[PDB]
Amino acid sequence: MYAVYKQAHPPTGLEFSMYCNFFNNSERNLVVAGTSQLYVYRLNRREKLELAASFSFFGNVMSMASVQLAGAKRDALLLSFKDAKLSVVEYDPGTHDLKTLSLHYFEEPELRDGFVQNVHTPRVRVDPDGRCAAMLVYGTRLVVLPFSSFLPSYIIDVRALDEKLLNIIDLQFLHGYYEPTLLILFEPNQTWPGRVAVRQDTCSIVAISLNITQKVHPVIWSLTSLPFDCTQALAVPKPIGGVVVFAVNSLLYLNQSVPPYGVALNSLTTGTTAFPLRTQEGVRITLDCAQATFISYDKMVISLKGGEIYVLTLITDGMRSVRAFHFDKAAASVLTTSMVTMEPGYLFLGSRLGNSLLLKYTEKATYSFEVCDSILNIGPCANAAVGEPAFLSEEFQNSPEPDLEIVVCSGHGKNGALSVLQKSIRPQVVTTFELPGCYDMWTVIAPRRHGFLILSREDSTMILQTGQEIMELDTSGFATQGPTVFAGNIGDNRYIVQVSPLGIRLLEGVNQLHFIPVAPIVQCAVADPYVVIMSAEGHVTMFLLKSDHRLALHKPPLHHQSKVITLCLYRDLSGMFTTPTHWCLLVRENGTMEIYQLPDWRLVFLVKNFPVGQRVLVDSPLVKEVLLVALGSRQSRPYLLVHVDQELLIYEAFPHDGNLKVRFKKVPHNINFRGRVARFRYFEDIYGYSGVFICGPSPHWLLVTGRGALRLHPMAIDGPVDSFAPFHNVNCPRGFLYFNRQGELRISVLPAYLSYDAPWPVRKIPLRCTAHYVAYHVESKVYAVATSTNTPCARIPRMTGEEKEFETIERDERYIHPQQEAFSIQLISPVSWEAIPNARIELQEWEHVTCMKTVSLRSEETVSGLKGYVAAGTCLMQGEEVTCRGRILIMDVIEVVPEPGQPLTKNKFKVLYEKEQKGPVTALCHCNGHLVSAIGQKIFLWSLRASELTGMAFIDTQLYIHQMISVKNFILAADVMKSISLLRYQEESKTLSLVSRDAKPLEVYSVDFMVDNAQLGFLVSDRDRNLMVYMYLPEAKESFGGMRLLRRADFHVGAHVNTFWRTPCRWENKHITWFATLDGGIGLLLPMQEKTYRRLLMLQNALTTMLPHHAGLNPRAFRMLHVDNAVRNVLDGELLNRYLYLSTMERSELAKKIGTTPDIILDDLLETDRVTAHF
Amino acid sequence: KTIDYNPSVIKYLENRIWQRDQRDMRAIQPDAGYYNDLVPPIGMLNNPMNAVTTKFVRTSTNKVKCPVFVVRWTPEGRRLVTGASSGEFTLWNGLTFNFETILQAHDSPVRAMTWSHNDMWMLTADHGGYVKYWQSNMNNVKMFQAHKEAIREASFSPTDNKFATCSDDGTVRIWDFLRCHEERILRGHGADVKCVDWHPTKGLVVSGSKDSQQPIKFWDPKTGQSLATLHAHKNTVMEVKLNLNGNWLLTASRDHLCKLFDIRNLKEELQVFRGHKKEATAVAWHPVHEGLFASGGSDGSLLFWHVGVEKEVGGMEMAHEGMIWSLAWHPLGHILCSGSNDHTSKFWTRNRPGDKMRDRYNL
């Protein structure tokens, strides 16, 4: 009933891309966009696309274009959304968010022409000259936007124009053309590939000339005779003009004065196309899903299907006409969904499936390709299984929670891969100790490798020597007669400085250089040849290296209006602080922040209310700790990390015009909090990674690589962490070093198999073949993966009534072959993720795997009930004229003696059962040791004997059951169209029954079980980007008696869902039902009580109205059921997360408008973040 | 022979994953080697002609050779039941069309036949006036008499509670389901009424006629009030159907025409459908492709239409012998059936890629 949907992984996989101004007219930016999320990329020089701004939308971007308005200093964006929504937005300076200029709601019942079901996506096009912009609405209406700086739009009825266009394969604006001429591909008589005897070819082109002022539309240059299968059209640029029209088999160039020139590509235009086509020599290929763009003029780079890249050269004569075409075979790449030229020589290849990457091309007319840094992508997650990691250390083995990570079949085709995803970092502990009484810690470098480990007790000071064998130091140096507040290197890892409350001891090694005595000290900062020392009463003293190496006192000239609470120091290796330069940060107790220039001592930056959390700061309670650090390539972008009233809130920095030309922007979180010890501990080069470790009740690794993307990684194993230090040794590599709450020092190294640059730490495992399914086998601890391969088809099965007869395909040598898929079942080892050799079940010639699950049949061999087999249902696709029959394949992993030299070969499949069934096998399950198979319209529940399956009980179900699950003798089933038939198997009598079903027809991807204390929900994802929970309620009267199900919660997720997990709680008995969305991300459903629900439903109705959302959108109407009667009961936890982002000056205003204190809602929201910290 | 929908759906489920839309789909290329790449309707949703069936499969004929009137699919698609003039239900198989069984239902020619919204019941009428309920295992359930004159068309409410039977005495009587109770009679129609369709949401009853003065009457099920009169044809509206979306009224009459009507706007008129050289007497909408429908004829013409195109998409002239009474698509839109006016019944499935249409039909 009552639940909440949270997003754990942000969705990856880019659909759209362009190269326009975003920040300023001076530089250019790659602007890519995926499912409801916008990314802006700069480019540093190897070249590595650096992230600059990431933006989260409450919609599903359906088109994107950019046109630069006159007078503006930037370039706007035109974001097309679902159910006809255009939104002109711009980047904003000042506040770093992106501003919204215009909204245009075009959803009208009289525009859809009676068509309820919307098939066509809205398409935005803009002029090359930047005169007007156009949107194709619903496949019929054209909206024209003339170029406050806007002009009011007008809708063109296309079927009211000439020639009765009636369709829209593609539409572009042409070049030249003082009036903004719009070209339109269409089909007046639409036809279908596979029916070409009665409709040979019908595609046409109308180039319409738009008058803005007169609002009349004359048709010029109609063609009418194009081939039947034309995909996208491309506007040829200005010095040549015209248009190239990609067909599936042919390629055309079209111009208004030149006669039509068109060539065929593969010999398939024999009996289908009567358009006059030549024969392109050399070339042999098909353009059916191709993405292409122009290098400056007369050169076009085409990314085909199969990832292959060609460079088409338009051979130009003296008349600026086209003689012929030239095709060359350049390097192959990722299966793209986009294509963009960047400046001169750089190409971007945006792809949903596969890693979208950056190319470099130079001449060699003929080009060669070099691959720059790619963007990591979790692709279309088809099936994913929850497994257990292998090398978790023995120090952490006694943790009470389960320790588990997920394995995701991502990508498709040549980019097919397994993705091993994981939340919080599990460190490898190589050496542990027990050192009681000491709480602070430091590691300094004494002459790369860390020399001294310095511990501060309450009474004395421990010093440890590192090296070959780490051992406690006994000699003079650091004063062990008291505690030490902080110890750090000065200079460049040459001279060591510690500070006790009494004085500031220098040190060069084993020998103290000199001593300088200074209210009790609390903290000091010694970063970058300047040492600033602060006592408890608010006194501040500064030191400095003076080589003649002796530090002199230079107390800052300050006029204290209130007491200084905390400090920080920072300098600019690659700095934006303009007006290596040193900066002092100082926070007073009145509530202000004051950034100081450090060699002199003048006020540069001033915030009136530094506590609270105001979202964007500008110049002119009880702050604990404040740290400015730089993170990224060459220490480029700085971050402000503060500690205010048990609440972490961190700030970025961005340039904005005698003061600092910077302002600070707040970024969201998932982290919560519940002498002076430092909690914000900056580390450089731990496993090559620079960043911050954040100590507290929930530790979090803060990482920024050269990508520039902020990465927060928790660490939930081994409890809360008191202190931390970077550590580099001989027997320990580049690593780290922390205390436990129970007082155990742990030498540690990060595990090397993961990659922490991604939002979750993930190891991407390339298969170079399409991963369909994956199944963790609990016994013997391996993964079973069904994969494919693309082989050319050569035979055609026929059914003559007596036997099967294959027909050999015999065509010309200039002919492309159809794709036959041969499936095989891999076996992946979690120890090292290489596939296990000599363990592969290869299927038949035409056979396709429809399902793989880990099915626990019952056996009298084990002392438990179950064994946990791997069962695969699979059938043969040989065309519609051949009867489809299937085969149930039950496999078990058996440990054998290993082959010498190969320790991974101890595991191997043994097939218990392989028999061809009577019909197709579509889905498999398990019910108390019974295998539940769905053949045709029947759902047999087999039973496993010694060697064979024996049937017990079936029913007659609906059309094509493709998903089934079951929980304690109750099966749920999922049709393509009838969507639900939940079953029940009585034990004693061998009978299976139908309890209830969804009476409405509905498309279904996959099903799940929402679990509460007593309420068992039936979660369904449904092809329309929704989620819905059906319950079986016989006492209710709006359902019929025990026959009809009722949906109780409706929620429009942005993306498709195939996978479903259940994890326990950490919420007496309610399971979290996880899912990984098909457009990249991973989501949650957490059931709640009604009392906690309606305090937050009053919050969401306040958060929807009173906040300026991105692209002027409605967060309510986006999360309303379908399309884009509804019974909504799922909260938007991505909108409730913007309650945490508000300042607690503004947090209390919404709490008074809904009638509570802000401290209750923070108790309500942060329990959701605490219990969902699995994986 | 066979037409198995299983390799199309599995190819759709493997293409379900990595396809964002239909604009991402790899195009089926017209050769006999691209047979695996066919997906059903619901997959290749735009490009509605798809599934415009004109490939012949089999002519399912009985031994007794009686002319058939109503043919409808079982809603799980397992089997075609067929109503003939001798009151016999001949159940035809759904993939290998050979034979399943012959019932004997009525003592009259079987006129109307409809299945429930769920898989539970099947309403069947006859030329005598009796209305029987039928379980999914084809067991006879309680019977009664609805009309004194032959019942020509039936159809029930958007729930299993209430049906309406129209007959040749001119009355459209609205019935309860469980109690078999005659709720009220819809009189004032002018002459004998031959078609009735309930609205899928709003609760309307739209009736045709043979009378030219009152050809189409919108009715109310809750009251007895005639909602709106809509004279639209010259003579004898044969069939009246409604989309599953509920916006459109499609009408077939004896004046060689089919007309679309918007029930929200009865003053104006949407497009008309010529080309039937004889009367159009069997209109049947397509279940998954809203805005296209099949249309039969009395000379045997089979024509396929689409909303927005002035001409027809494609079809068959003088192919099917005799009349055509009724058509029923499979719950997946791949195969179509028809009740011929002779003593046969022909099955039509979409054209394969790469074949040349050189047979007796089409070309």
Curated annotation (Swiss-Prot), chain A:
Tissue: Widely expressed, with high expression in the retina.
Subcellular location: Nucleus, Nucleoplasm
Matches recorded under InterPro entries: Beta-prop_RSE1/DDB1/CPSF1_1st (IPR018846), Cleavage/polyA-sp_fac_asu_C (IPR004871), RSE1/DDB1/CFT1/CPSF1 (IPR050358), WD40/YVTN_repeat-like_dom_sf (IPR015943)
UniProt GO MF annotations: enzyme binding; mRNA 3'-UTR AU-rich region binding
Keyword Metal-binding: no
Placement of sequence motif Nuclear localization signal: 665-674
Function: Component of the cleavage and polyadenylation specificity factor (CPSF) complex that plays a key role in pre-mRNA 3'-end formation, recognizing the AAUAAA signal sequence and interacting with poly(A) polymerase and other factors to bring about cleavage and poly(A) addition. This subunit is involved in the RNA recognition step of the polyadenylation reaction. May play a role in eye morphogenesis and the development of retinal ganglion cell projections to the midbrain.
Subunit architecture: Component of the cleavage and polyadenylation specificity factor (CPSF) complex, composed of CPSF1, CPSF2, CPSF3, CPSF4 and FIP1L1. Found in a complex with CPSF1, FIP1L1 and PAPOLA. Interacts with FIP1L1, TENT2/GLD2 and SRRM1. Interacts with TUT1; the interaction is direct and mediates the recruitment of the CPSF complex on the 3'UTR of selected pre-mRNAs.
Name the record gives this protein: Cleavage and polyadenylation specificity factor subunit 1
Curated annotation (Swiss-Prot), chain B:
Compartment list: Nucleus
Superkingdom to which the source organism belongs: Eukaryota
Disulphide linkage map: none
WD-type repeats, residues: 63-102, 105-144, 146-185, 188-229, 232-271, 275-315, 319-358
Tissue specificity comment: Most highly expressed in testis.
Residues spanning the signal sequence: none
Family as reported in the entry's similarity comment: Belongs to the WD repeat WDR33 family.
Function summary: Essential for both cleavage and polyadenylation of pre-mRNA 3' ends.
Assembly and binders: Component of the cleavage and polyadenylation specificity factor (CPSF) module of the pre-mRNA 3'-end processing complex. Interacts with CPSF3/CPSF73.
Protein name: pre-mRNA 3' end processing protein WDR33
Gene label: WDR33
Full-protein residues shown: 55 to 417 of 1336
